[PDB]
Amino acid sequence: MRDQEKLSLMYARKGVAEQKREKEIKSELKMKQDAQV
Amino acid sequence: GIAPGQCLPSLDLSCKQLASGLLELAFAFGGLCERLVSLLLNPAVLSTAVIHFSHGEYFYSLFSETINTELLKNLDLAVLELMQSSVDNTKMVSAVLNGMLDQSFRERANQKHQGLKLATTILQHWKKCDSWWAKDSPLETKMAVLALLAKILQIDSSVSFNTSHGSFPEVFTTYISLLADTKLDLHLKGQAVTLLPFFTSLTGGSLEELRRVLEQLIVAHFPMQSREFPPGTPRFNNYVDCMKKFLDALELSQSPMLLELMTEVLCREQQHVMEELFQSSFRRIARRGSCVTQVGLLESVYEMFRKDDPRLSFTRQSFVDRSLLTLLWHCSLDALREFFSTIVVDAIDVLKSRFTKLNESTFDTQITKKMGYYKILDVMYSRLPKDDVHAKESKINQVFHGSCITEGNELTKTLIKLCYDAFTENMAGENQLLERRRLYHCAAYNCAISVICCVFNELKFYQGFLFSEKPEKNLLIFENLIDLKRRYNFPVEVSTLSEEMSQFDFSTGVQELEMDELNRHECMAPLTALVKHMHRSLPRDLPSWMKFLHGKLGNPIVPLNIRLFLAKLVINTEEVFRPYAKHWLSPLLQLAASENNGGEGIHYMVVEIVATILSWTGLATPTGVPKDEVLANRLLNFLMKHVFHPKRAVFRHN
């Protein structure tokens, strides 16, 4: 990838994906620990 | 009670239900339909804190449901006196007609007779509203006509399609008049051509008129060839919109007549702006069923290709290359014998012709004809079983007369000999049409691959046909396939609610490989195909064909591009060249190390070559041979001589 901007926008989508994943996993961890065996 | 007497009497969730029940009772009392229509078209304007009312439009908008139910209880009357006032109250009449139409369409489950009755009754009075779509009528009124008609003949079917079953002459005259006007612009004509899947199912005489008006649309509203106005401009947006409308209409109705327009406009440009949508539409067309109309489509495009039609060779090639080929591939049938046997007899005859090198134009036409025919044969053989061309089936039965003692191997050899003649042809004395004959040879070899991939999968016909050359008389193979003059670049690195939304739609009327420079050589993909095939068909070396590739590859006199192409083939087929690796070192390492590799000493093929050659470590032992050792050392010295490449990532990769 020789285009820095296109790579940056692809990782804009990517990084917002990991941000959403982190938020949802942080939310899930509460009851995941609550009911874990 | 809804009229102000002082800004506006606001309704409520109960204040409106009360009125609903009240006027439902009022309709229950007696007929009252004539009165209802009368004050529904009343033009008395209201106003609120502006005016923008008619007190019938508000009245209808409020209820619109019990009103429609009463209007449908006695349909024939209400429609008659509703269209009675078409000229002076066209807005409200059209709104009420649409309301009744989609009311009935909502109720097409419990009943079917009522929607049909409504449509037939409106059509019976279609003359009553001729000022709507007449000349000088406001364009909004013309779009109202189009939407009304779309609903009318979408509710049930185009029951007015044959022998003037309904008011067909009036409908068709309206539609052709709308499509034929000159003052009008492209997007209204696009929503007009949205209504084609209803009129491209009728016999000739009037279908000729539809075709002629469509041609007059294509001319005088489309670019000279294509893409003469840049994107963004209204011209470009309108043209693209019309193209999408045509393509969806075509994909909806598998109508041969639209093919001779869509492919005709597609294949006078080198590549269209929105070509991918063309191919997606064709794939949709072919892959759904109704084998007979599929045959008709194939025959139509084939007639376009085959007929004399004095024109550019490129256009004739494009016909088959885009339209017919993508039709043939995606899905036609496993038993679509019609076009199959239709083309077998006449394709071979054209292949058994003599190049009239007198005029360049006729020679180019002949080359294009043969190329197209024989690509067709390629796709035939690729997507077709083996027995139905060799067994006691319709192969001898059709290339010769009736059943024959020979099983099916008559057309096979009949075409194979001329295949091999075409792509193993001397070119020393010919210097007039280089690229075209190159493509002819290429397609020759491609369908040779496809045929011989289906000749009873015998152990060895591949070497004698695909790979056997006769250099003693300049009867070669790869010197014809490859251009041998185009310097390759090689850059360094690169339920209920679905029904509800359908009702809303009705009312609104709205809703592998890397293609770098060399894998795109029209022989690369089939070559890898049969290589992976015949490896998976049955350890010094496999009988004679990798020897052919070795001699053409591991030899620095074979001109550059053959070596590059074969090396790319070996890269893409390393899975099958792996157990014979010990021989593919001097060729591959010699090519990578050789400083005559092209350009600056290209740094893309070397990357893939080295990755492949190192993939099989523990195999093939690049030591023990002095030439191998010196080649490896040359490779290493050159490779560290060129590492920097200011981009950081590629430097780390090196």
Next chain:
Amino acid sequence: AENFRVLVKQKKASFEEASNQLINHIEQFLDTNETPYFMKSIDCIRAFREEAIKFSEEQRFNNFLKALQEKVEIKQLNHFWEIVVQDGITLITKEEASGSSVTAEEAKKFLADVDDLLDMI
């Protein structure tokens, strides 16, 4: 390309840069065998004739007529000649110059082993 092409034809910046472009357009319109394209081409040549007469462009007019005549003689097209002779378009005919009152005559005067591999299967 019906009204926009006409507005291109009526005037541009110089007496060029649209000439050769429309030459290509009419050539590719002649390439396709649909008659409406031929009608569009005859409309284009009529517009060019009137524009050359009304704008002192005899040189372009005569050069274009000679070039198109040679081209259409070269290629295998007849119906275009059919419509042209049904109308009649050629070079200037008055005095081989700008203006005169001489009846058209120049157009009239110029236009009345391995084989064993096959069968061992």
Next chain:
Amino acid sequence: SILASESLNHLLYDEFVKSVLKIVEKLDLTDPAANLHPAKPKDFSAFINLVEFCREILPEKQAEFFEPWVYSFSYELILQSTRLPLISGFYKLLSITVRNAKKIKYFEGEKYSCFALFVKFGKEVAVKMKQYKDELLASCLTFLLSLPHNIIELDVRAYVPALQMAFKLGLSYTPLAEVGLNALEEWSIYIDRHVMQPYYKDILPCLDGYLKTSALSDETKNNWEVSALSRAAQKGFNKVVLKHLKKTKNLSSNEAISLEEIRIRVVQMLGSLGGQINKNLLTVTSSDEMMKSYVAWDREKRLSFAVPFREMKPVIFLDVFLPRVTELALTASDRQTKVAACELLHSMVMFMLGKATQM
């Protein structure tokens, strides 16, 4: 405000309610909790989406927007629920309706028609709840305990077996325990302090199970392990720490309620419930049921189990853990405690059978 707006909120709310009512009107609701779905399958999915969306949209801005809608909404929902009592999702809409209808007072008994409607429907459902299962029962309890009952004080005996059921179905489904706590609070403050009094001895003993954790639940780390905010903080107090704090403040913690929050709320309830009422968790101070609790299950020690060591094999008696093991297995209130208790109880019963008739 920049866009020049007087009553757009009102129109949008009204149209949202109208759309919801129209969707519910034509949905054909004939997963289902008992081996039966002779209905359109893609209708329940739509219904569930709409119901959850309503619960997360309707309650906010519960103001006089919803006031003219209560009677119509409740009447349609109660009709179509009476004809379809196994729905589990008309009750959620009823819950939202009643919560919004008692956020504004709307209840001091037109309005009287809605009041009688809910009196009948509430008593009807409080009687029909006795035959339902997990999700349907949870929704029915949510609705029932959502009834105003500040004014529906009539035959609280009908609603008590609901409330305590909620407390039982907590310890495994926290939201329902939260609902039970809110309902008990509302009843304690607003109902007259003379008719509630005979029922406390029935209600409170269900709360005891929530007080069964003794600061041994360290399942997850009770402190920050590693965070980008921690990494930034370790190198100074500067802009990056500020950015990490600003993004983490609006985490929007919509996880419903933790169990320890419920336990804290239980203690706050017990304290806020008085000192006279408060004593009702325990038994009644040397009645019969206390003195029956002081006697061993079996007078003769059985389940004599010899623990295998290298040299001794000492004998313990498994008949001394059985009480505590059973109360632990039933009402552990902690999933990881519960699974271990159930496993041990399984093993104990199996040992009981083995020693019942061995050699």
Next chain:
DNA sequence: AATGTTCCAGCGGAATCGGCAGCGGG
């Protein structure tokens, strides 16, 4: 009044150092 001294104010060299950009990776 003529001048020398004192005082105050302003500019720059030099060292330090922190964060401001921009530039790759995720």
